[PDB]
Structure formats: C-alpha cells, structure tokens
Write a protein that binds this DNA or RNA. Structure first.
Length: 113
DNA sequence: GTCCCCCGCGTTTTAACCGCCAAGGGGATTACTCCCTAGTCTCCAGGCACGTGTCAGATATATACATCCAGGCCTTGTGG
C-alpha cells in the first residue's frame, strides 16, 4: 500500500497506516454515464517515519485529472485520524469501514476499488 | 432515432341526389327599317429615305470604400 505521489509533503517522510489485515488506504469511484459522473475519491491514513504522528491524505477529480485535495494533520491522535478517515469513507459509500469485507454497492454513491 | 400525421375503419346523420309538380325568364325565331361602312376618284401632307453633327456613354485612369479570410481575447457555462 504506497503513499500517493501527489502527497508530496508526506511521500519523503511517511507510510500508510496498517494493523493486521486492516489497511487504511482506499480508492473510491463514481462512474455513471446517465448523470455523466466519472469521479474518484482517494483516502489514506498516513503515519510519519520520525515520530508517532498521523495525517489523513485525500484527493479527488475526474478519472485522468486532478480536482482538489486535503491533508488533515492529527497531532498524534490516532483515534481522531481514524474517525476522519472512516467518516469520509461512510459518507462516500454508505458502507461502514467494518463492513469492507462484505461491501455492497449503492445508487448515487461511490463504488470501492 | 423518434415524434405524430395521416391510413384504415365503426357509428352517426344530413344534404347530395332523386320524382315530379309551377311559374315565367330569356334564348331562338321571324319580321322592320334605316343606319354603316364598303367602294370611286381626286388632293395633298404624314411619314418615310437619307444627309450630317451634337453629345451619350464606353473605354480607360487614378483613386477611395465594401467585405471575404485568416489571425487574435473576454465572459458565461459544465462538472467538481
């Protein structure tokens, strides 16, 4: 699970956060030709190399382009960093993060992977 | 590709088509009677044959505008 190359502030000094099979890196996509959507939303929880500190990287756009982005620094609070990551995933997919092993598709929402 | 006009056909009904009975308008016929234009011969000027030169406009000529073909920015719209 690589750090997004567009996250240039963290790519040289951080890695994707993981615990066992629970890997906090996910790409989401909404392709719909009736509405003419073809947009992605990336979410990555990052941990710094030098210290026990965290940030949620996020990036969006139409597939093949950039839209806007965000890097939410969490000041060593992993619970806050996970809550931000999981809330954005839930809002975009209408699935809980604990349901990732049994994910189900929803109209007017992003698909996963 | 898809919007909908016109093709085909059941039900309703009125005015086109059918019988024949009236009144008289107006086209056809035969008769009246003098007005119209063909026909004669003579006069003469409208109109045509043909000299001749003014002046319209074609032929340049130098010049100023109309409008076609690239070549070149600013505001409103779609999706995020």
């Amino acid at each position: 699970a690589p750090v997004d190359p567009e996250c240039t502030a963290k790519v040289g000094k951080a890695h994707v956060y993981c615990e066992g099979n629970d890997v906090y890196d996910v790409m989401l996509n909404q392709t719909n030709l009736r509405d003419n959507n073809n947009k992605y939303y990336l979410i990555q929880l990052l941990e710094d190399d030098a210290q026990r500190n965290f940030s949620v990287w996020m990036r969006w756009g139409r597939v093949g382009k950039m839209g806007q982005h965000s890097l939410v620094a969490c000041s060593g609070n992993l619970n806050k960093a996970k809550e931000i990551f999981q809330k954005k995933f839930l809002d975009k997919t209408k699935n809980n993060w604990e349901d990732r092993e049994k994910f189900e598709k929803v109209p007017g929402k992003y698909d996963m992977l």
